[PDB]
Design a protein around this nucleic acid. Structure first.
Lengths: 206, 263, 60
RNA sequence: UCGCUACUACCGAUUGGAUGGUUUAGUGAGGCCCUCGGAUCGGCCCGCCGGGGUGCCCUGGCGGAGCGCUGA
RNA sequence: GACGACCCAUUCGAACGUCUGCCCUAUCAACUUUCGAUGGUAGUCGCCGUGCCUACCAUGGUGACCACGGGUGACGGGGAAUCAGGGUUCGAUUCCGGAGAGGGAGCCUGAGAAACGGCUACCACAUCCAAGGAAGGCAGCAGGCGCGCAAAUUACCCACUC
RNA sequence: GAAACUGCGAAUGGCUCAUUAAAUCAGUUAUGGUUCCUUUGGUCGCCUACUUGGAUAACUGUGGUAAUUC
């Protein structure tokens, strides 16, 4: 119906070619996923040669990663901020490859606190002392220090990172096609990208 | 016509090395899918009534194959058509006969009878090396056998002897200059001669010179060469003719010399 | 119309033909698979309830 | 040149007629996708009986309640 | 032994893409573009590559070496007739490739179809009816009407070839 | 052993030349840009298991429509 033909469209000279063969099943469209954020709705689509293709509508979880220290945990996908293909897609909260979105930022802290033995940015130390100090202080004899010594000075954590934990959000990059895969996935922004997209955000809105 | 795959091949579309006539009807057998390619096959039924003449109609072959007197590559087959090609062994155990499919210098599949002892193995070219899962290797051959754990110095364009009984190759030949080779396709076909020289081009369609024991030099593409044994010493039995590739004048001279068309 | 009364504990079923408006008024303006009292159908029914399973319009 | 017959082409009022294809705008069948919709049909919990077991349990049969929760 | 299933290889292919090759016409010389024309960047879609499609951005692309437009009683090729040499003319038609099943469009099933000996709708036709409804597509083999200068049996049979 | 469910084929063939001027098509090349029924060869162990759950056809019986492989 809606098709992805190539026997339409002008040649280089501005010429036209007269109608040749009728539309066929291997040149075919099928309308866009237009996936949002919400409760999971998945549809299974039969596709050529078999080998079913998953189309995801309204995901709310993706597997992001923090490849700086190589941990990857499942985290909720809150809202869109920047979509580098169009401005309109952000307004209706459409989710596609290479967007910039927000997450809860929760397990990354839990991992950091247990492994590097330090909290991130904090409102107050009063919260920590009755519980959440129980993990941070430890009763080991022998391997209070012995393990943790090797973790020291490999946890400088950068300025633009640390400030974001306090808000409870982090900026990560969709590196999947949700409409073809059936899953959202990605990597979290680091380095110069994370400097770049801040400037685009503050430029465009506000 | 086409919307999917075809299931007919006519008489006149079919290759000329099956030596078909033109006064039986429009269709020809067409080999069904298998390890060999249809411009290199000899379909089974063409061996049984257009060569050896046991059968006379296609319905007779259907009554023969069901009885399970036929084998191919030491296993039992039971259909009108099977796509056996170069270097396979047919085995009828009731008559005590064994055949081999190999090329005349004319370039067509002949009758090359052999001892049953010879018919316990065949010679197979290596074409591709492919590392499988968890650090295990594979071979790929033209008869489409995947033989795991080969020796780690065997590479493509070599040939390997396979025991039909147990698989799992016992020995091999290494591709080297001065080893004896047979041709399997192209304009030169059925010629036997040593390698002599190689030629390489980065890209594709490298060629391979050849010379025989009649003092003639010729060349062919790389991928039409098949190794048969070390220099002037085949590790297989050879038919009459022996890759000489006589001119037409000399062939005339032989026939009028023996005066041979009667016994 | 007719009816096809059916007894599903012998597997038997029989016909009967009526055109009395009142007895059929019990069935009128109701969808399939509703149950209604068949006691309206006469004096040989007095604790029967039936279920209508459908039928055939005119022109089949 | 003018007069006589066969014959062919051209111009032409009629803003000719007929048939076919393009083209703006409006209207738009049918299917597909998406978002809703819930006719209707089941399952699992509490009574009585049957079987097994410790008034109660499991399973089967039968009825009714909330039809509660749940699937199609 | 039989059947089924996941993956890899193989076979039969399928689908896109490279370079070169074309009949008549200028009383057809400029053509193509936000109704994407050419390119860049990102995304959607698709079996995959790709302006295929969308957003943003650039202003290109093609032509006297004939573009663009129009015409063709133009399906293409393997070939055929004539012929000293060079040519000319023909190729609907038994092999190979392609396109189409009254005209258009959409779609189901399946590994493979935008299928018509499958389906749904519109349009042009034509059939039955108790007038409430229902059913159809011979460019398959025969056969009929029509059209014309112009073209065969409503025959016999799966034995051969598949 | 009729019938009926299930698997498979019906996308092959046959026919026509209407459309179609870099299109079709031919020679030559490319999948390191992809899909592939089938055959062939490999792949085959991180109060229920002495075998689990509940419906449909043929069939039996009663019908409707002028008419249909309804």
């Amino acid at each position: 119906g809606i098709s992805r033909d190539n026997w339409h469209k002008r040649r280089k000279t501005g010429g036209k070619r007269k109608p040749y063969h009728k539309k066929r099943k291997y040149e075919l469209g099928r309308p866009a996923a237009n996936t949002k954020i919400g409760p999971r709705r998945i549809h299974t689509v039969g596709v050529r040669g078999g080998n079913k293709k998953y189309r995801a509508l309204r995901l709310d979880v993706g597997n992001f990663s923090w490849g700086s220290e190589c941990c990857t945990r499942k985290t909720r996908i809150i809202d869109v901020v920047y979509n580098a293909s169009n401005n309109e897609l952000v307004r209706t909260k459409t989710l596609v490859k290479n967007c910039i979105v927000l997450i809860d930022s929760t397990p990354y802290r839990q991992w950091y606190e247990s492994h590097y033995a330090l909290p991130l940015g904090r409102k107050k130390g009063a919260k920590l002392t009755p519980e959440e100090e129980e993990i941070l202080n430890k009763k080991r004899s022998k391997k209070i220090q012995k393990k943790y010594d090797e973790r020291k000075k490999n946890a400088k954590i950068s300025s633009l990172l640390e400030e974001q934990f306090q808000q409870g959000k982090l900026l990560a990059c969709i590196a999947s096609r949700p409409g073809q895969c059936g899953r959202a996935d990605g990597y979290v922004l680091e380095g110069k990208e994370l400097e770049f997209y801040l400037r685009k955000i503050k430029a465009r809105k506000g | 016509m086409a919307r999917g795959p075809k299931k007919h091949l006519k008489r006149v579309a079919a290759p000329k090395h099956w030596m078909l006539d033109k006064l039986t009807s429009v269709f020809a057998p067409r080999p069904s899918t298998g390890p060999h390619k249809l411009r290199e096959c000899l379909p089974l039924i063409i061996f049984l009534r257009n060569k050896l003449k046991y059968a006379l109609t296609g319905d007779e072959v259907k009554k023969i194959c069901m009885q399970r007197f036929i084998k191919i590559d030491g296993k039992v087959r039971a259909d009108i058509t099977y796509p056996a090609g170069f270097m396979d062994v047919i085995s009828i155990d009731k008559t005590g006969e064994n055949f081999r499919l190999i090329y005349d210098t004319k370039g067509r599949f002949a009758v090359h009878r052999i001892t049953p002892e010879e018919a316990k193995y065949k010679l197979c070219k290596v074409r591709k090396i492919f590392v499988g899962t968890k650090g295990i290797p594979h071979l790929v051959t033209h008869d489409a056998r995947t033989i795991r754990y080969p020796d780690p110095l065997i590479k493509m364009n070599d040939t390997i002897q396979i025991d039909l009984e147990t698989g799992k190759i016992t020995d091999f030949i290494k591709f080297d200059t001065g080893n004896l080779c047979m041709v399997t396709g192209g304009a030169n076909l059925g010629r036997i001669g040593v390698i002599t020289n190689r030629e390489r081009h980065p890209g594709s369609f490298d060629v391979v010179h050849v010379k025989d024991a009649n003092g003639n030099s010729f060349a062919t593409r790389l991928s039409n060469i098949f190794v048969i044994g070390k220099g002037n010493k085949p590790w297989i039995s050879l038919p009459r003719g022996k890759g000489i590739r006589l001119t037409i004048a000399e062939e005339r001279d032989k026939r009028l010399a023996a005066k041979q068309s009667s016994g | 119309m007719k009816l096809n009364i059916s007894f599903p504990a012998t597997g038997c079923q029989k016909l009967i033909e009526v055109d009395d408006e009142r007895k059929l008024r019990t069935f009128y303006e109701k969808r399939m698979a509703t149950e209604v009292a068949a006691d309206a159908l006469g004096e040989e029914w007095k604790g029967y309830v039936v279920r209508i399973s459908g039928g055939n319009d005119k022109q089949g």
